[PDB]
From a paper:
We expressed, purified, and determined the X-ray crystal structures of two AaR2 proteins: one in which the DNA sequence of the expressed protein lacked the intein (AaR2) and a second in which the nascent protein still included the intein sequence (AaR2_genomic). Following purification, SDS–PAGE analysis of AaR2 and AaR2_genomic proteins showed that they were of the same size, indicating that for the AaR2_genomic construct, the intein had successfully spliced itself out of the nascent protein sequence to generate mature AaR2. We crystallized the mature AaR2 and AaR2_genomic proteins and determined the X-ray crystal structures to resolutions of 1.73 and 2.10 Å, respectively. Autocatalytic splicing of the intein in AaR2_genomic generates a peptide bond between Leu229 and Cys230, which thereby brings Glu228 and His231 into position to serve as ligands for the dinuclear metal site. In contrast, the di-iron site of the AaR2_genomic structure showed electron density consistent with the presence of two iron atoms, termed Fe1 and Fe2. The two irons are coordinated by four carboxylates (Asp97, Glu127, Glu194, and Glu228) and two histidines (His130 and His231). A higher occupancy is observed for Fe1 compared to that of Fe2. Fe1 was modeled with an occupancy of 0.8 and is positioned by residues Glu127, Glu194, Glu228, and His231, in addition to an ordered water molecule, whereas Fe2 was modeled with an occupancy of 0.25 and is coordinated by Asp97, Glu127, His130, and Glu228. The distance between the two iron atoms is 3.8 Å. The phenolic oxygen of the presumed radical harboring tyrosine (Tyr134) is positioned 3.1 Å from Asp97 and is 4.7 Å from the nearest iron atom.
pmcThe enzyme ribonucleotide reductase (RNR) synthesizes the deoxyribonucleotides needed for DNA synthesis from their corresponding ribonucleotide precursors. Class I RNRs are composed of two proteins, a large α-subunit (R1) and a smaller β-subunit (R2) that exist as homodimers, that combine to form an active heterotetramer. Aquifex aeolicus is a hyperthermophilic bacterium with an unusual RNR encoding a 346-residue intein in the DNA sequence encoding its R2 subunit. We present the first structures of the A. aeolicus R1 and R2 (AaR1 and AaR2, respectively) proteins as well as the biophysical and biochemical characterization of active and inactive A. aeolicus RNR.
Author numbering:
A (entry chain A), B (entry chain A): 7 to 327
Write the structure that this text describes.
């Protein structure tokens, strides 16, 4: 089931916005934005593109360079490096992969939303370069960008995230599309969140609160990104039920469980109970709470039915802007 | 010469920013933005992404709906429709094609700049939908989006712009890459500029000055877009001289001349000497002046050596924000 990439202009395209599909539609590829079939796509474009606009270099980085230099434990510095190294990798993969999704989507408003998302991932990449230029020395910043070259746990996370995307790239069929889409949702649902919790920990004890400002903006973006793919997956289920074979529906629950498992083993490798305010048990229930939250939001039963409340419920108010 | 699309993560990638190439480089595809080989790419990202940020819906559209309703000649309304219809088509093609360029570029800072450009093209698409929702009735706005369905001159412009891009899409080789790149530069250099001159005409007689506000923002964006591809083409010439065969170098001067010719035949079909302040002769020298300006900026002799001054030199000060 080989998804063609639409031609640049289709004079035999449907005039009728009502006939749009997320995939395999018959558009003109003119952005006929006087009629919107997916109001969520256009609302999310306006939210990411205009409402939540932000400039990383307008966040003051006056203090963090000192707190790093003298006030951070050797464990806090290790975490800082690992977390920032991995988030740099994630946002790099996303800038690139979202171009693959956008060029396959046949609904203009959804392509618009994906373009805005791609742009926000580029802003994140700008934010990390600004965080490091401000906070650390030049060889150290190079080392953090390159830390996968020294840390096999980090290298293996990266190769694994790339694996799911490269199957679709190399073999661009409907199956490999749904799995990439699910992989995107998992990556935005889960893989930021050991990282975010750790920064909001450092920050609730008044450490690296400049870095934490940057992180709050990134995390606002990532909730919009999660919402966008939630809608794409749930609309894809309605519009293309053939694609959610029982094999696929099973795999979705396998990967979501694996993914929850790994984010926890990273959360714990990063921290190692050496970070005041977070331990290996709190981590486990955060990621399992997030897993159920996100797999149910896309039409599945909880995967960790024991967990029902959010261990870190304080983050919801801290992370607000 | 078949340009592979880089894999999502390359652990065998060069660590050394100095070794980046615009195409056919060997990157990790981690955005290692602590070292920038192409300062112009990163400066242009910051300029498009942060400095020149703008929100179309924050431009007041109080007057234009009335001026359209009563004050615009039947010829002024025809132009308005044709110009806006064609710019909607251009910006649609660009949002989509820039995803093709970004996924082929191996220098992260240039991919960043292309992402920002893609995002600005989406903002333009938002601007046109806002211009029409404000200025005209719902069936008329649909008609303007769809005007290629009624006007064979407009349909043929569209199919022609798509042709150059689809060769690269269908046959993604080095030759078809350079021609697409040149086509992008021509489209941003020329194909906006009958349209821009016409709006700044309407606007120097105090007609549709709200539309003209929107247009000034779009035209600031398009000058950054022209600069970006100027640099890409001139860097591609240094880095890949094999690709600028004499066949190619000849074709570049053919298409640039054709393209100047067509933009004039559109400029004249749109207006028809029925627009106070612009005639078929002024058009001819504007587009020929722009042609030399842009083909020389990418290492060629003037193509209209008779023309040396800019007929509409007043636009440079009018269009400023
Ligand atoms: Fe991000
Ligand atoms: Fe994201
Ligand atoms: Fe545009
Ligand atoms: Fe443009």
């Amino acid at each position: 089931n080989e998804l063609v990439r639409k031609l640049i202009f289709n004079p035999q395209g449907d005039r009728e916005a009502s006939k749009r599909k997320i995939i395999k539609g018959n558009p003109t590829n003119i952005f006929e934005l006087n009629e919107i079939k997916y109001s969520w796509a256009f609302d999310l474009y306006k939210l990411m593109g205009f409402t939540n606009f932000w400039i990383p270099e307008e966040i003051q980085m006056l203090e963090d360079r000192k707190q790093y230099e003298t006030v951070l434990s050797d464990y806090e510095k290790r975490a800082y490096e690992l977390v920032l190294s991995f988030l740099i990798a994630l946002d790099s993969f996303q800038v690139d992969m979202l171009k693959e999704f956008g060029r396959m989507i046949t609904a203009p408003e959804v392509e618009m939303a994906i373009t805005a998302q791609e742009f926000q991932e580029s802003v994140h990449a700008y934010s990390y370069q600004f965080i490091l230029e401000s906070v650390v020395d030049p060889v150290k910043a190079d080392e953090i960008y390159n830390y996968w070259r020294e840390d096999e746990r980090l290298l293996e996370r990266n190769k694994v995230i790339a694996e799911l995307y490269n199957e679709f790239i190399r073999k661009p069929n409907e199956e490999n599309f749904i799995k990439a889409t699910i992989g995107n949702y998992i990556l935005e649902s889960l893989y930021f969140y050991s990282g975010f919790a750790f920064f909001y920990t450092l920050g609730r004890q008044g450490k690296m609160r400049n870095t934490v400002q940057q992180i709050k903006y990134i995390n606002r973006d990532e909730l919009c990104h999660v919402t966008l793919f939630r809608n794409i997956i749930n609309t894809l289920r309605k519009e293309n039920p053939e694609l959610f074979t029982p094999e696929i529906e099973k795999w979705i629950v396998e990967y979501f469980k694996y993914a929850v498992n790994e984010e926890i083993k990273w959360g714990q490798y990063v921290t190692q109970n050496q970070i005041l305010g977070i331990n290996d048990v709190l981590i486990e229930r955060y990621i399992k709470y997030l897993g159920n939250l996100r797999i149910t939001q896309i039409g599945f039963d909880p995967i960790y039915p024991e967990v029902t409340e959010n261990p870190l419920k304080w983050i919801d108010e801290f992370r607000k802007i």
